[PDB]
Amino acid sequence: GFRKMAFPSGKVEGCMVQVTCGTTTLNGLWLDDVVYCPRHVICTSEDMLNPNYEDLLIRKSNHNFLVQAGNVQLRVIGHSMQNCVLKLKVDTANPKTPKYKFVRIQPGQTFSVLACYNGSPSGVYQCAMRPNFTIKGSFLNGSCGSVGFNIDYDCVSFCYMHHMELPTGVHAGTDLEGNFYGPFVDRQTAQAAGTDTTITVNVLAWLYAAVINGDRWFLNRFTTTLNDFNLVAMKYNYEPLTQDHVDILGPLSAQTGIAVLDMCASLKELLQNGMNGRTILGSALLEDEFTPFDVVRQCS
Amino acid sequence: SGFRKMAFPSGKVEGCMVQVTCGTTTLNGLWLDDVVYCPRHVICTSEDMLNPNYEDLLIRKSNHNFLVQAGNVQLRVIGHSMQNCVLKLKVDTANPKTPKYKFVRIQPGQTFSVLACYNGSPSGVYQCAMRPNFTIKGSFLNGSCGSVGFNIDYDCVSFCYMHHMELPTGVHAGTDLEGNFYGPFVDRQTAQAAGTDTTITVNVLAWLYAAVINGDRWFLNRFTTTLNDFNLVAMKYNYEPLTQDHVDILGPLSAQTGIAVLDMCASLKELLQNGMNGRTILGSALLEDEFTPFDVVRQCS
Ligand SMILES: *C(=N)[C@H](C[C@@H]1CCNC1=O)NC(=O)[C@H](CC(C)C)NC(=O)OCC(C)(C)Sc1ccccc1
Ligand SMILES: *C(=N)[C@H](C[C@@H]1CCNC1=O)NC(=O)[C@H](CC(C)C)NC(=O)OCC(C)(C)Sc1ccccc1
């Protein structure tokens, strides 16, 4: 079988706290003796329209920040700002802090999101960083400060902190250094994204997943060159496929005996002909939020 | 569409996963208080699995034949018993991470989160729906048996599924935590097959309510139907009939939208009998059936 699978979220759950400033409450990430959260927690509804954050922050004191880990208040003993993230120093260390690193992910890479409200984890799901640097998440009011992550060995690599929704219903946020993915800003304005494209290497991985699980109706006897495939891909607002992508897809090619460029010829046919009402792995649309690694890990 | 399969945070279940080994056969177990629950076929050799006599295999077993480990730390077994297709191993340590919990038997259509585990180590979490033919469309590899499915209500974990088997069609079958299989399956390495599946009507209705909540309501009509007339029609399209419990669990969405359940049934009947005619609902020409009414409330509100 084949499902969108998230990483087990327990190591991150043990880090989630609630942060309140004024009448604004959102989530923070408590690692060692520092709580990370979105800096717009310090804004009023008036401030949000055009916030001078350095000016707003210098007017705040440590005691204006209420941090709760469950039923327990954590005392803030210092604060600083790093881009769009606020770092609240507290007087106690989190014993549940996992081994962790902060990473900035590339478009096309996937990660798990732990959606939280009032410091309490609510749900976990898998996302991709889109080529236009949005993510297609599920986030409601109070979700800011929810984080995205991957787990490798017992190391949690944090890559995303949630800040905003766009009018189209997609989402935007920062890495854990507080730098946005994409051309977005933490002000209360309607913001559009650049034109999105489909993550081609991921669609190919997913087609190989469909073969592994006995779905082959979309295959064909033909082949294509890499450049001729990329010409068609770009026409259809698909990302180009690089030789590194082809290399990355090797194991799936070897496993199934279908050459990468043969699978490219299959996808080319699907882009030009459509699915004609058929489905692949249950989906009526081509799925692009499984990486080659995601498919490998889950199929072997 | 705006909706996606969302799992429950898995930490409270991660803290209960162990591994159980008999001989060279290792699968996963669930450690709650001082009991470990796991599939009874852990006591089988690969050759026993072809035609096991479980009562006879068990009488030959002693407490000291069971290796239970949390990570690489052994948990001493002090008692053992069989309950249907589950083995209960009493251990000498109460799990300090035991959450508030209950054991529940779910109905077809209900969704739950699966924490896929190998050698007692969690690999991934995903949302599953119990199909009307009592299979789930999981993602499971060798060594996954004993992985559990669950829902979390407030702080209480309701365990509903323990994994035992993969069928030829690639779907999965298992038990509740009292060891009673969902559906007509048995824990023996003998050819078995899933019954013909059907569409989960209550969940399609939940999906239509979700569409309405998001302002996509072209499919609403001025008509209604009786429950019996709808059920008889639905079965001709390989949709499940509705139960009274289904009507009841659509109550909150009906109240939220002001659309009576049977009026929504009449709208669905028209979609079944006339097709979409090229239109979409929530951006899809396909009707989704693995979001329950509770799931829709979770993601809309
Ligand atoms: C953090 N807790 C929220 C999370 C948002 C709320 C709803 N879903 C989400 O992901 N973040 C915000 O509310 C941010 C805060 C600013 C200071 C960055 N603002 C935001 O996301 O606004 C969304 C819009 C602009 C209201 S979209 C819209 C525009 C016009 C008409 C209808 C909708
Ligand atoms: C538990 N660790 C495994 C999980 C299986 C392994 C691969 N993916 C899975 O979900 N459970 C088994 O191997 C069980 C054990 C018996 C005692 C129930 N056996 C099993 O699932 O085999 C399938 C059947 C019953 C033989 S049906 C079938 C026939 C032919 C081809 C495929 C399936």
UniProtKB/Swiss-Prot annotation, chain A:
How activity is controlled: the entry says:
Inhibited by pyridone-containing alpha-ketoamides compounds 13a and 13b. In turn, alpha-ketoamide 13b (tert-butyl (1-((S)-1-(((S)-4-(benzylamino)-3,4-dioxo-1-((S)-2-oxopyrrolidin-3-yl)butan-2-yl)amino)-3-cyclopropyl-1-oxopropan-2-yl)-2-oxo-1,2-dihydropyridin-3-yl)carbamate) inhibits SARS-CoV-2 replication in human lung cells. Inhibited ex vivo by michael acceptor inhibitor N3. Inhibited ex vivo by compound 11a and 11b.
Identify the residue ranges that face the Cytoplasmic compartment according to the record. Answer: 1-300
Active site location: H40 (for 3cl-pro activity), C144 (nucleophile)
State the source organism's domain of life. Viruses
Q: Spell out the reaction equation it catalyses.
A: TSAVLQ-|-SGFRK-NH2 and SGVTFQ-|-GKFKK the two peptides corresponding to the two self-cleavage sites of the SARS 3C-like proteinase are the two most reactive peptide substrates. The enzyme exhibits a strong preference for substrates containing Gln at P1 position and Leu at P2 position
- Where is the protein localized? Host cytoplasm; Host Golgi apparatus; Host nucleus
Q: Where is the Peptidase C30 domain?
A: 1-300
Q: Where is this cross-link: Glycyl lysine isopeptide (Lys-Gly) (interchain with G-Cter in ubiquitin)?
A: K4, K89
Outcome of mutating L204V, per the record? In strain: Zeta/P.2
Subunit = 3CL-PRO exists as monomer and homodimer. Only the homodimer shows catalytic activity. Interacts with host FBXO22; this interaction promotes the proteasomal degradation of nsp5.
**Function per UniProt:** Cleaves the C-terminus of replicase polyprotein at 11 sites. Recognizes substrates containing the core sequence [ILMVF]-Q-|-[SGACN]. Cleaves and inactivates human TRMT1, preventing tRNA guanine(26)-dimethylation of tRNAs. May cleave human NLRP1 in lung epithelial cells, thereby activating the NLRP1 inflammasome pathway. May cleave human GSDMD, triggering alternative GSDME-mediated epithelial cell death upon activation of the NLRP1 inflammasome, which may enhance the release interleukins 1B, 6, 16 and 18. Also able to bind an ADP-ribose-1''-phosphate (ADRP).
What is this protein called in UniProt? Answer: 3C-like proteinase nsp5
What organism is listed for this UniProt entry?
A: Severe acute respiratory syndrome coronavirus 2 (2019-nCoV)
Gene designation per UniProt: rep
Report where the shown chain sits in the full-length sequence: first residue, last residue, total length.
3265 to 3564 of 7096
UniProtKB/Swiss-Prot annotation, chain B:
Q: Which reaction does it catalyse?
A: TSAVLQ-|-SGFRK-NH2 and SGVTFQ-|-GKFKK the two peptides corresponding to the two self-cleavage sites of the SARS 3C-like proteinase are the two most reactive peptide substrates. The enzyme exhibits a strong preference for substrates containing Gln at P1 position and Leu at P2 position
**Cytoplasmic side of membrane:** 1-301
Q: Where is the Peptidase C30 domain?
A: 1-301
Glycyl lysine isopeptide (Lys-Gly) (interchain with G-Cter in ubiquitin): where is this cross-link? K5, K90
Q: Could you say how this protein's activity is regulated?
A: Inhibited by pyridone-containing alpha-ketoamides compounds 13a and 13b. In turn, alpha-ketoamide 13b (tert-butyl (1-((S)-1-(((S)-4-(benzylamino)-3,4-dioxo-1-((S)-2-oxopyrrolidin-3-yl)butan-2-yl)amino)-3-cyclopropyl-1-oxopropan-2-yl)-2-oxo-1,2-dihydropyridin-3-yl)carbamate) inhibits SARS-CoV-2 replication in human lung cells. Inhibited ex vivo by michael acceptor inhibitor N3. Inhibited ex vivo by compound 11a and 11b.
The annotated consequence of N142A reads: Does not affect ability to cleave and inactivate human TRMT1
Tell me where in or outside the cell this protein is found.
Host cytoplasm; Host Golgi apparatus; Host nucleus
Effect annotated for changing M49A = Does not affect ability to cleave and inactivate human TRMT1
Provide the active-site residues from the annotation. Answer: H41 (for 3cl-pro activity), C145 (nucleophile)
Q: What does this protein do?
A: Cleaves the C-terminus of replicase polyprotein at 11 sites. Recognizes substrates containing the core sequence [ILMVF]-Q-|-[SGACN]. Cleaves and inactivates human TRMT1, preventing tRNA guanine(26)-dimethylation of tRNAs. May cleave human NLRP1 in lung epithelial cells, thereby activating the NLRP1 inflammasome pathway. May cleave human GSDMD, triggering alternative GSDME-mediated epithelial cell death upon activation of the NLRP1 inflammasome, which may enhance the release interleukins 1B, 6, 16 and 18. Also able to bind an ADP-ribose-1''-phosphate (ADRP).
How does this polypeptide assemble, per the annotation? Answer: 3CL-PRO exists as monomer and homodimer. Only the homodimer shows catalytic activity. Interacts with host FBXO22; this interaction promotes the proteasomal degradation of nsp5.
Identification of the protein by name: 3C-like proteinase nsp5
Species:
Severe acute respiratory syndrome coronavirus 2 (2019-nCoV)
The gene from which this protein is expressed is: rep
Q: What range of the parent protein does this fragment cover?
A: 3264 to 3564 of 7096
